Amino acid sequence: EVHLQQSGPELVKPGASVKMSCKTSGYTFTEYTIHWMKQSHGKSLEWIGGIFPNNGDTTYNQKFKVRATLTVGRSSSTAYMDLRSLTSEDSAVYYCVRNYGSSYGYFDVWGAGTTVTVSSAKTTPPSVYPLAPGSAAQTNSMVTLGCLVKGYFPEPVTVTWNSGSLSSGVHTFPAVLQSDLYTLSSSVTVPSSTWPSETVTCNVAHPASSTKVDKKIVPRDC
Amino acid sequence: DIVLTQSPGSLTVSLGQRATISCRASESVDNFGKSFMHWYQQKPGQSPKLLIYRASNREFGIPARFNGSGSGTDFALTINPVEADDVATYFCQQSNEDPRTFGGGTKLEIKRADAAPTVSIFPPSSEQLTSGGASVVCFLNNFYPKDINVKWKIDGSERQNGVLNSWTDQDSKDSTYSMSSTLTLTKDEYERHNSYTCEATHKTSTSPIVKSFNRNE
Amino acid sequence: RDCSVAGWLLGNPMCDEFINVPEWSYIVEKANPVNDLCYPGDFNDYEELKHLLSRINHFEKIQIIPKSSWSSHEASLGVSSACPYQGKSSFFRNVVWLIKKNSTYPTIKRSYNNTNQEDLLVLWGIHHPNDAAEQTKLYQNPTTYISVGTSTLNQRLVPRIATRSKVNGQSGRMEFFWTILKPNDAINFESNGNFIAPEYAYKIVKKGDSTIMKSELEYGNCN
Amino acid sequence: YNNTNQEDLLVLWGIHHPNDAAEQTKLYQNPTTYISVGTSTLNQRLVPRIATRSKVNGQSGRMEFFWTILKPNDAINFESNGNFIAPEYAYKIVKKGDSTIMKSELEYGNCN
Ligand SMILES: *[C@@H]1O[C@H](CO)[C@@H](O[C@@H]2O[C@H](CO)[C@@H](O[C@H]3O[C@H](CO[C@H]4O[C@H](CO)[C@@H](O)[C@H](O)[C@@H]4O)[C@@H](O)[C@H](O[C@H]4O[C@H](CO)[C@@H](O)[C@H](O)[C@@H]4O)[C@@H]3O)[C@H](O)[C@H]2NC(C)=O)[C@H](O)[C@H]1NC(C)=O
Ligand SMILES: *[C@@H]1O[C@H](CO)[C@@H](O[C@@H]2O[C@H](CO)[C@@H](O[C@H]3O[C@H](CO[C@H]4O[C@H](CO)[C@@H](O)[C@H](O)[C@@H]4O)[C@@H](O)[C@H](O[C@H]4O[C@H](CO)[C@@H](O)[C@H](O)[C@@H]4O)[C@@H]3O)[C@H](O)[C@H]2NC(C)=O)[C@H](O)[C@H]1NC(C)=O
Ligand SMILES: *[C@@H]1O[C@H](CO)[C@@H](O[C@@H]2O[C@H](CO)[C@@H](O[C@H]3O[C@H](CO)[C@@H](O)[C@H](O)[C@@H]3O)[C@H](O)[C@H]2NC(C)=O)[C@H](O)[C@H]1NC(C)=O
Ligand SMILES: *[C@@H]1O[C@H](CO)[C@@H](O[C@@H]2O[C@H](CO)[C@@H](O)[C@H](O)[C@H]2NC(C)=O)[C@H](O)[C@H]1NC(C)=O
Ligand SMILES: *[C@@H]1O[C@H](CO)[C@@H](O[C@@H]2O[C@H](CO)[C@@H](O)[C@H](O)[C@H]2NC(C)=O)[C@H](O)[C@H]1NC(C)=O
Ligand SMILES: *[C@@H]1O[C@H](CO)[C@@H](O)[C@H](O)[C@H]1NC(C)=O
């Protein structure tokens, strides 16, 4: 296959430097130029640069000439990018992408995306709260259940229901900024008969703090 | 720099119809007789995807519904028929001349059957309350059109301060939005009232959908 | 790279990088590609086919007979040490080495109709075994044949037995054939043994000027 | 035969196409025959072909000869059941170079 596995989301103090990596696999590293793309959160794609592995020739955008540095580890079958002296500006997502042929080519295989967060803020583990419905109210054929993740930094977090086996009625809403911390919520929807008989557990993970938490939805004790 | 400008910025098209997104290049992107334009698809929440290379030919594994067309200074990605899993932002990017430049991007929305919000209100956790804060959550799942209006009422009197809203992107599978609406308070600020309400005003119901709960039960 | 044109089209396991290629301008082939017919044999009118490639700029590979659709024959047992993928010995990805299920080998009667708009390159093959023993061990029926028909094709292939020197460890031989199946036309196979059936085939998506260059060199990032 | 030599080897052999089942059975016994020949490259199975044909040098039968180049360290494997015209002698290609086959009725002239 043509998979591009890249580095994990990162946080950098303003003024510091990052080095996200992209590991190539499934084709011949040395036959195609690898490139980097920056996407300002939900806006527009910007081209950073390109590097051809086989001899290490680089091709940069005007904008990034200074702050960026593409490098390649041939034995490693790996492309690296380095961003030096960051600002809020650089807080966005970076894609490691394989372009097909040369100067006049199309980017056919796009990597996952290493997402960089530039803030002086400290790393903060979340707090998880189960959401059992009101003691005297029931939504008819289907019961909506929930999970609340509040006060954590930085993004992101992963929310699962029953370790992942429930993937149906689930909505995980985007995080929001509240007193300079992130907060989000999830909503699993099961048939009224299944609950409270069925074990509904909320599985939340926050890598940045090495935290993994589980919360079971217990009906309203009344 | 070859400035690429896509139009329109956002496009809402009925299911089973034709989406027509345009691209316009500041200078031509078109020598050697071929156009060096490319279309990219970014389905929400994931990396972009390659649709069309050199303005007209589909990448392997792309359905015929995508019509790449154009030459020279202006092009067009035509999606027809529009399916459910086509909610995405579409990008055109030129390779004719460094520095590689992309379009603004065009977000595509699907017009479907007006669905009503499945509201559900939730009291703050006991575990949270022992920590000192109250959080009244109120989901508004699976609806259309996008526009909705949540109101919070505490004992008949309205409130905005403490509210945090969050919509998901149009679901790729059923073309329906969902919404969170948390209301955060402190234990003491909370214990000084009784009824907590959540009035959603949609174009679906001509009268406000309500779900509420009383503090002591 | 180290694949040959045959290696690529038949889909030698070592050529996986080329399973599904985008439009090309010319093909480049080394003088002696290491990855060619891993299982020894022969490729019929191989040069005439290569000549056809000199006029083609794009294939889109399609499935015309799914591997999974072979009910009354073993399709997953059709593998060989002559074609290692990674330890686990394998086979050409684009054709199935069908073999007897239970003790038996029913007459195959399969056909594909070209509902596409473009000419279709279809590939298949025949197995030439070492002796009657191996013949009977792998297929059952001792006197076999493969018949293939188009609006223009009238082929009946018959396996040929002979004692031969080992090549890549096999004293057996594999002989591949091909045809171009016009739009709206169909190809009808029938066989009773030693058949190597199509799984994937190639649509001639666009035609134009190209060539098969012989060069040891690799891609240069240039125009 | 295995080519233990260092040079390419030219091997010749043949098959007999008889007049009728009678002569087939008169000279060989088995009525249904074949000759199989194999190399690292060769995969031949010859089958005698019966048909009634005009006499040429008094014979209505025909002889059909075949050949291959058997690389050094490689072997040629015959198997047969009838109508086989087997090799005795074969040719080592001792040196290769430029030559041609001229068509001329003339004979050697003691000159250069
Ligand atoms: C591979 O599949 C292809 C598609 O399935 C096959 O193509 C088809 O060929 C068949 C004939 O073999 C065509 O079948 C009938 O064609 C017409 C139907 O109407 C047509 O003619 C109109 C004008 O007269 C057009 O305006 C229409 O659009 C339409 O195309 C009939 O005239 C026939 O009916 C009569 O003849 C048959 C004998 O063949 C009798 O059995 C009937 O009872 C009747 O008397 C044809 O049946 C079919 O149209 C055509 N497909 C398309 C899409 O055009 C192709 O043959 C196949 N290949 C193989 C090798 O199998
Ligand atoms: C025609 O005749 C030729 C000569 O008579 C045949 O050539 C011979 O080929 C065979 C293999 O087909 C060779 O046999 C063994 O070769 C080596 C012996 O050591 C050699 O290889 C080392 C590196 O591996 C070198 O460093 C040495 O200097 C030396 O040259 C072994 O690797 C094998 O022996 C082992 O494997 C077999 C299983 O196959 C076991 O049975 C053995 O007991 C042992 O465990 C090879 O068998 C032979 O070397 C070679 N002859 C010559 C002179 O080089 C030719 O194959 C034949 N052709 C046909 C079509 O029949
Ligand atoms: C492998 O091949 C075997 C031999 O062909 C085959 O055995 C056969 O099994 C079928 C049913 O599975 C039998 O069919 C008949 O058997 C009895 C007796 O007549 C009836 O009750 C049935 O309704 C039916 O008419 C065959 O009789 C039997 N043949 C022999 C010689 O035993 C196996 O089934 C094959 N294996 C598989 C997995 O298919
Ligand atoms: C073909 O040769 C020309 C001539 O050297 C190359 O173009 C010149 O050199 C550089 C390369 O872009 C430019 O700065 C010059 O201004 C060019 N001069 C002229 C007169 O064109 C060109 O790059 C070469 N083409 C290829 C494909 O290598
Ligand atoms: C080719 O022709 C030349 C000239 O016609 C020959 O050279 C002559 O050789 C004879 C004796 O062999 C001498 O008497 C002459 O004086 C030579 N002529 C010259 C000009 O030197 C030559 O021998 C001929 N070659 C052959 C093979 O017959
Ligand atoms: C793309 O659109 C053009 C213009 O309408 C049309 O002529 C052409 O047939 C379309 N291409 C495909 C492959 O449908």
Short mmCIF file of N, CA and C in Angstrom, two decimals, chain B residues 73-198:
data_model
loop_
_atom_site.label_atom_id
_atom_site.label_comp_id
_atom_site.label_asym_id
_atom_site.label_seq_id
_atom_site.Cartn_x
_atom_site.Cartn_y
_atom_site.Cartn_z
N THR B 73 -7.46 29.39 -17.92
CA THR B 73 -7.51 30.26 -16.77
C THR B 73 -8.62 29.81 -15.82
N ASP B 74 -9.67 29.16 -16.33
CA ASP B 74 -10.80 28.74 -15.48
C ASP B 74 -11.21 27.31 -15.69
N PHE B 75 -11.56 26.65 -14.59
CA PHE B 75 -11.95 25.24 -14.64
C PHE B 75 -13.17 24.99 -13.80
N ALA B 76 -13.56 23.72 -13.77
CA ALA B 76 -14.74 23.36 -13.02
C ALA B 76 -14.81 21.90 -12.67
N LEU B 77 -15.03 21.66 -11.38
CA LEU B 77 -15.31 20.33 -10.89
C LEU B 77 -16.81 20.20 -10.83
N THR B 78 -17.33 19.20 -11.53
CA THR B 78 -18.76 18.95 -11.57
C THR B 78 -19.09 17.63 -10.89
N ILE B 79 -19.86 17.71 -9.81
CA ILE B 79 -20.31 16.51 -9.14
C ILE B 79 -21.76 16.31 -9.46
N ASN B 80 -22.04 15.20 -10.15
CA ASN B 80 -23.39 14.95 -10.63
C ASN B 80 -23.53 13.49 -11.11
N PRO B 81 -24.38 12.70 -10.44
CA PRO B 81 -25.29 13.07 -9.35
C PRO B 81 -24.63 13.24 -7.97
N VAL B 82 -25.13 14.17 -7.16
CA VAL B 82 -24.59 14.40 -5.81
C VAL B 82 -25.07 13.29 -4.88
N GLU B 83 -24.15 12.65 -4.16
CA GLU B 83 -24.56 11.60 -3.24
C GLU B 83 -24.46 12.07 -1.80
N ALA B 84 -24.69 11.16 -0.86
CA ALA B 84 -24.72 11.54 0.54
C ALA B 84 -23.33 11.85 1.05
N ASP B 85 -22.40 10.92 0.80
CA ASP B 85 -20.98 10.98 1.21
C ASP B 85 -20.11 11.89 0.32
N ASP B 86 -20.61 13.09 0.09
CA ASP B 86 -19.95 14.07 -0.76
C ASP B 86 -19.79 15.34 0.02
N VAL B 87 -20.24 15.34 1.27
CA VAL B 87 -19.98 16.49 2.11
C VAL B 87 -18.52 16.56 2.33
N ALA B 88 -17.96 17.65 1.85
CA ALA B 88 -16.55 17.88 1.97
C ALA B 88 -16.28 19.28 1.50
N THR B 89 -15.04 19.70 1.72
CA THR B 89 -14.54 20.92 1.13
C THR B 89 -13.61 20.50 0.00
N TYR B 90 -13.84 21.10 -1.17
CA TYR B 90 -13.12 20.75 -2.38
C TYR B 90 -12.06 21.80 -2.74
N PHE B 91 -10.86 21.34 -3.08
CA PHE B 91 -9.78 22.26 -3.39
C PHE B 91 -9.21 22.05 -4.77
N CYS B 92 -8.96 23.15 -5.47
CA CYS B 92 -8.19 23.09 -6.70
C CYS B 92 -6.81 23.68 -6.41
N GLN B 93 -5.79 23.04 -6.97
CA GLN B 93 -4.40 23.43 -6.81
C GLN B 93 -3.65 23.28 -8.13
N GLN B 94 -2.84 24.28 -8.47
CA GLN B 94 -2.09 24.26 -9.72
C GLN B 94 -0.62 23.77 -9.53
N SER B 95 -0.05 23.14 -10.57
CA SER B 95 1.33 22.64 -10.49
C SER B 95 2.16 23.21 -11.62
N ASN B 96 1.51 24.03 -12.44
CA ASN B 96 2.12 24.69 -13.58
C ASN B 96 3.37 25.49 -13.22
N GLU B 97 3.40 26.02 -12.01
CA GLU B 97 4.50 26.91 -11.65
C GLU B 97 4.63 27.15 -10.14
N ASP B 98 5.76 26.78 -9.56
CA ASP B 98 6.02 27.07 -8.15
C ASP B 98 5.89 28.58 -7.93
N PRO B 99 5.45 28.98 -6.74
CA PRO B 99 5.20 28.05 -5.65
C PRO B 99 3.80 27.45 -5.77
N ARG B 100 3.68 26.14 -5.53
CA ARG B 100 2.41 25.43 -5.63
C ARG B 100 1.38 26.18 -4.86
N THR B 101 0.28 26.50 -5.51
CA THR B 101 -0.72 27.28 -4.84
C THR B 101 -2.08 26.53 -4.91
N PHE B 102 -2.87 26.66 -3.83
CA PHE B 102 -4.20 26.05 -3.73
C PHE B 102 -5.30 27.10 -3.84
N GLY B 103 -6.52 26.62 -4.03
CA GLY B 103 -7.69 27.49 -3.97
C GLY B 103 -8.11 27.78 -2.53
N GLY B 104 -9.09 28.67 -2.36
CA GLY B 104 -9.60 28.95 -1.03
C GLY B 104 -10.22 27.66 -0.53
N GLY B 105 -10.95 27.00 -1.42
CA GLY B 105 -11.63 25.77 -1.08
C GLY B 105 -13.11 26.06 -1.13
N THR B 106 -13.90 25.06 -1.49
CA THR B 106 -15.35 25.20 -1.52
C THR B 106 -16.03 24.12 -0.68
N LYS B 107 -16.83 24.55 0.31
CA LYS B 107 -17.55 23.61 1.16
C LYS B 107 -18.92 23.28 0.57
N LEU B 108 -19.16 21.98 0.45
CA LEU B 108 -20.38 21.45 -0.13
C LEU B 108 -21.34 20.94 0.93
N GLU B 109 -22.61 21.35 0.84
CA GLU B 109 -23.63 20.92 1.80
C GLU B 109 -24.78 20.25 1.05
N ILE B 110 -25.37 19.23 1.68
CA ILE B 110 -26.46 18.49 1.07
C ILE B 110 -27.82 18.98 1.59
N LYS B 111 -28.75 19.31 0.69
CA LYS B 111 -30.11 19.67 1.09
C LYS B 111 -30.91 18.38 1.18
N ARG B 112 -31.49 18.14 2.35
CA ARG B 112 -32.31 16.95 2.57
C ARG B 112 -33.63 17.33 3.23
N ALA B 113 -34.33 16.29 3.66
CA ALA B 113 -35.63 16.44 4.29
C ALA B 113 -35.49 17.08 5.66
N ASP B 114 -36.27 18.13 5.91
CA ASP B 114 -36.22 18.81 7.19
C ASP B 114 -36.47 17.83 8.29
N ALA B 115 -35.48 17.59 9.14
CA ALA B 115 -35.64 16.68 10.25
C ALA B 115 -35.73 17.51 11.54
N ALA B 116 -36.38 16.95 12.56
CA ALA B 116 -36.57 17.64 13.83
C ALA B 116 -35.53 17.18 14.88
N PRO B 117 -35.08 18.12 15.70
CA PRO B 117 -34.02 17.90 16.68
C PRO B 117 -34.42 16.98 17.83
N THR B 118 -33.68 15.90 18.01
CA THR B 118 -34.00 15.02 19.12
C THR B 118 -33.32 15.51 20.43
N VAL B 119 -34.00 16.47 21.07
CA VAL B 119 -33.51 17.13 22.27
C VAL B 119 -33.47 16.18 23.44
N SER B 120 -32.54 16.39 24.35
CA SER B 120 -32.45 15.58 25.55
C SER B 120 -31.63 16.36 26.57
N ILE B 121 -32.21 16.63 27.75
CA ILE B 121 -31.55 17.46 28.80
C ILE B 121 -30.93 16.62 29.93
N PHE B 122 -29.81 17.09 30.45
CA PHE B 122 -29.07 16.31 31.42
C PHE B 122 -28.64 17.17 32.60
N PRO B 123 -28.88 16.68 33.82
CA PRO B 123 -28.40 17.32 35.04
C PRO B 123 -26.93 17.05 35.23
N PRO B 124 -26.27 17.93 35.96
CA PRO B 124 -24.85 17.81 36.28
C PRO B 124 -24.52 16.56 37.08
N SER B 125 -23.33 16.02 36.87
CA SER B 125 -22.96 14.81 37.57
C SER B 125 -22.78 15.06 39.03
N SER B 126 -23.04 14.03 39.83
CA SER B 126 -22.82 14.12 41.27
C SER B 126 -21.33 14.27 41.57
N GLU B 127 -20.50 13.57 40.79
CA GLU B 127 -19.05 13.60 40.95
C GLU B 127 -18.50 14.97 40.65
N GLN B 128 -19.10 15.64 39.67
CA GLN B 128 -18.71 17.01 39.31
C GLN B 128 -19.12 17.97 40.42
N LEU B 129 -20.30 17.75 41.00
CA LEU B 129 -20.85 18.63 42.03
C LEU B 129 -20.03 18.59 43.31
N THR B 130 -19.46 17.43 43.61
CA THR B 130 -18.55 17.29 44.76
C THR B 130 -17.23 18.03 44.49
N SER B 131 -16.97 18.31 43.22
CA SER B 131 -15.79 19.07 42.81
C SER B 131 -16.08 20.57 42.81
N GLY B 132 -17.36 20.94 42.77
CA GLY B 132 -17.77 22.32 42.99
C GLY B 132 -18.54 23.05 41.90
N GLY B 133 -18.68 22.42 40.75
CA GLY B 133 -19.31 23.03 39.60
C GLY B 133 -20.47 22.23 39.04
N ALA B 134 -21.36 22.96 38.39
CA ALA B 134 -22.54 22.39 37.79
C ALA B 134 -22.50 22.50 36.29
N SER B 135 -22.98 21.50 35.58
CA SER B 135 -22.95 21.54 34.14
C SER B 135 -24.19 20.91 33.56
N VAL B 136 -25.07 21.77 33.07
CA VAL B 136 -26.28 21.31 32.42
C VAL B 136 -26.09 21.15 30.93
N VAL B 137 -26.04 19.90 30.47
CA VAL B 137 -25.83 19.58 29.06
C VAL B 137 -27.11 19.31 28.30
N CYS B 138 -27.15 19.69 27.05
CA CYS B 138 -28.40 19.54 26.34
C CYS B 138 -28.11 19.30 24.85
N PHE B 139 -28.19 18.04 24.43
CA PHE B 139 -27.92 17.64 23.06
C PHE B 139 -29.10 17.90 22.16
N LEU B 140 -28.82 18.20 20.90
CA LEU B 140 -29.83 18.47 19.89
C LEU B 140 -29.41 17.74 18.62
N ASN B 141 -29.63 16.43 18.61
CA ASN B 141 -29.06 15.59 17.56
C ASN B 141 -29.93 15.44 16.31
N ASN B 142 -29.25 15.17 15.20
CA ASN B 142 -29.86 14.77 13.95
C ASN B 142 -31.01 15.68 13.48
N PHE B 143 -30.64 16.78 12.85
CA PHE B 143 -31.62 17.70 12.29
C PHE B 143 -31.14 18.37 11.01
N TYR B 144 -32.04 19.10 10.38
CA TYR B 144 -31.77 19.82 9.15
C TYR B 144 -32.97 20.74 9.00
N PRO B 145 -32.78 21.99 8.54
CA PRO B 145 -31.58 22.70 8.14
C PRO B 145 -30.61 22.92 9.28
N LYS B 146 -29.46 23.54 8.99
CA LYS B 146 -28.36 23.70 9.94
C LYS B 146 -28.76 24.60 11.10
N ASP B 147 -29.46 25.67 10.73
CA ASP B 147 -29.83 26.74 11.64
C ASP B 147 -30.78 26.25 12.67
N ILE B 148 -30.45 26.54 13.92
CA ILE B 148 -31.24 26.16 15.06
C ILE B 148 -31.00 27.26 16.08
N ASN B 149 -31.82 27.33 17.11
CA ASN B 149 -31.67 28.38 18.11
C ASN B 149 -31.94 27.87 19.54
N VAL B 150 -30.90 27.58 20.31
CA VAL B 150 -31.10 27.11 21.68
C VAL B 150 -31.25 28.30 22.64
N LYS B 151 -32.21 28.19 23.56
CA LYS B 151 -32.44 29.15 24.66
C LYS B 151 -32.30 28.41 25.99
N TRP B 152 -31.72 29.04 26.98
CA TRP B 152 -31.70 28.41 28.29
C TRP B 152 -32.62 29.18 29.23
N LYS B 153 -33.42 28.48 30.02
CA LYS B 153 -34.25 29.17 31.00
C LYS B 153 -34.03 28.56 32.38
N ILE B 154 -33.75 29.40 33.37
CA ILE B 154 -33.65 28.92 34.73
C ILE B 154 -34.79 29.58 35.51
N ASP B 155 -35.76 28.75 35.91
CA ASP B 155 -36.97 29.18 36.61
C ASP B 155 -37.70 30.28 35.85
N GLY B 156 -37.96 30.02 34.57
CA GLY B 156 -38.70 30.92 33.71
C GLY B 156 -37.89 32.08 33.15
N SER B 157 -36.81 32.46 33.82
CA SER B 157 -35.98 33.58 33.34
C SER B 157 -34.80 33.09 32.49
N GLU B 158 -34.64 33.74 31.33
CA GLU B 158 -33.65 33.37 30.32
C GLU B 158 -32.21 33.56 30.86
N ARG B 159 -31.23 32.96 30.18
CA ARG B 159 -29.81 33.10 30.54
C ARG B 159 -28.89 32.77 29.35
N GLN B 160 -27.86 33.59 29.12
CA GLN B 160 -26.90 33.29 28.04
C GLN B 160 -25.49 33.00 28.60
N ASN B 161 -25.17 33.67 29.69
CA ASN B 161 -23.82 33.61 30.21
C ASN B 161 -23.52 32.29 30.89
N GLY B 162 -22.52 31.57 30.36
CA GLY B 162 -22.17 30.23 30.83
C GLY B 162 -22.40 29.14 29.79
N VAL B 163 -23.01 29.55 28.68
CA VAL B 163 -23.36 28.68 27.55
C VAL B 163 -22.18 28.46 26.56
N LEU B 164 -21.99 27.20 26.15
CA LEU B 164 -21.02 26.79 25.13
C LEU B 164 -21.69 25.85 24.12
N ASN B 165 -21.75 26.28 22.86
CA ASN B 165 -22.39 25.49 21.79
C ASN B 165 -21.38 24.83 20.86
N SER B 166 -21.76 23.72 20.26
CA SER B 166 -20.83 22.97 19.42
C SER B 166 -21.59 22.16 18.37
N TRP B 167 -21.44 22.46 17.09
CA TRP B 167 -22.15 21.68 16.08
C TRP B 167 -21.22 20.65 15.45
N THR B 168 -21.73 19.51 15.01
CA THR B 168 -20.86 18.62 14.22
C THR B 168 -21.02 18.98 12.78
N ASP B 169 -20.11 18.51 11.94
CA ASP B 169 -20.29 18.72 10.52
C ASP B 169 -21.41 17.86 10.02
N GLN B 170 -22.06 18.30 8.94
CA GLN B 170 -23.10 17.53 8.29
C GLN B 170 -22.66 16.07 8.15
N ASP B 171 -23.41 15.13 8.73
CA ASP B 171 -22.97 13.74 8.74
C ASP B 171 -22.90 13.19 7.32
N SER B 172 -21.79 12.54 6.99
CA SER B 172 -21.57 12.05 5.64
C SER B 172 -22.63 11.01 5.25
N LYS B 173 -23.18 10.32 6.24
CA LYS B 173 -24.08 9.21 5.98
C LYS B 173 -25.59 9.62 5.86
N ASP B 174 -26.10 10.47 6.77
CA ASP B 174 -27.54 10.82 6.75
C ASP B 174 -27.82 12.28 6.44
N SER B 175 -26.75 13.07 6.30
CA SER B 175 -26.82 14.51 6.01
C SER B 175 -27.57 15.37 7.05
N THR B 176 -27.39 15.01 8.32
CA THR B 176 -28.00 15.69 9.45
C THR B 176 -26.98 16.25 10.44
N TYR B 177 -27.22 17.47 10.92
CA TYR B 177 -26.33 18.10 11.90
C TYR B 177 -26.68 17.64 13.30
N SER B 178 -25.79 17.89 14.25
CA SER B 178 -26.07 17.62 15.65
C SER B 178 -25.50 18.79 16.42
N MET B 179 -25.96 18.99 17.65
CA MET B 179 -25.48 20.12 18.45
C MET B 179 -25.38 19.84 19.97
N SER B 180 -24.30 20.29 20.61
CA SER B 180 -24.17 20.25 22.05
C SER B 180 -24.52 21.64 22.60
N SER B 181 -24.89 21.75 23.87
CA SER B 181 -25.13 23.08 24.45
C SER B 181 -25.01 23.03 25.95
N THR B 182 -23.78 23.12 26.42
CA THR B 182 -23.49 23.01 27.82
C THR B 182 -23.73 24.33 28.52
N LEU B 183 -24.18 24.26 29.77
CA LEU B 183 -24.38 25.45 30.59
C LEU B 183 -23.65 25.26 31.94
N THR B 184 -22.52 25.94 32.14
CA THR B 184 -21.70 25.72 33.34
C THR B 184 -21.96 26.78 34.43
N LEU B 185 -22.12 26.30 35.67
CA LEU B 185 -22.34 27.09 36.89
C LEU B 185 -21.57 26.51 38.07
N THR B 186 -21.47 27.27 39.16
CA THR B 186 -20.89 26.70 40.38
C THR B 186 -21.98 26.13 41.27
N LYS B 187 -21.60 25.16 42.11
CA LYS B 187 -22.53 24.42 42.95
C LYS B 187 -23.51 25.35 43.64
N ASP B 188 -22.97 26.39 44.27
CA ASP B 188 -23.74 27.39 45.01
C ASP B 188 -24.65 28.25 44.11
N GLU B 189 -24.16 28.64 42.93
CA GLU B 189 -24.93 29.39 41.92
C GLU B 189 -26.09 28.58 41.40
N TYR B 190 -25.87 27.27 41.46
CA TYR B 190 -26.77 26.24 40.96
C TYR B 190 -27.87 25.88 41.95
N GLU B 191 -27.47 25.73 43.21
CA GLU B 191 -28.38 25.33 44.28
C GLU B 191 -29.30 26.46 44.71
N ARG B 192 -29.31 27.53 43.95
CA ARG B 192 -30.12 28.67 44.31
C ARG B 192 -31.22 28.81 43.29
N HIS B 193 -31.61 27.69 42.68
CA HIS B 193 -32.70 27.66 41.71
C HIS B 193 -33.31 26.26 41.63
N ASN B 194 -34.29 26.08 40.75
CA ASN B 194 -34.97 24.79 40.66
C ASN B 194 -35.07 24.22 39.25
N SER B 195 -35.80 24.90 38.37
CA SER B 195 -36.11 24.34 37.04
C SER B 195 -35.14 24.78 35.93
N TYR B 196 -34.58 23.80 35.23
CA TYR B 196 -33.65 24.09 34.17
C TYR B 196 -34.17 23.61 32.82
N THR B 197 -34.37 24.56 31.92
CA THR B 197 -35.07 24.35 30.65
C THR B 197 -34.16 24.55 29.41
N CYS B 198 -34.63 24.15 28.24
CA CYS B 198 -33.77 24.12 27.09
C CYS B 198 -34.58 24.28 25.80
#
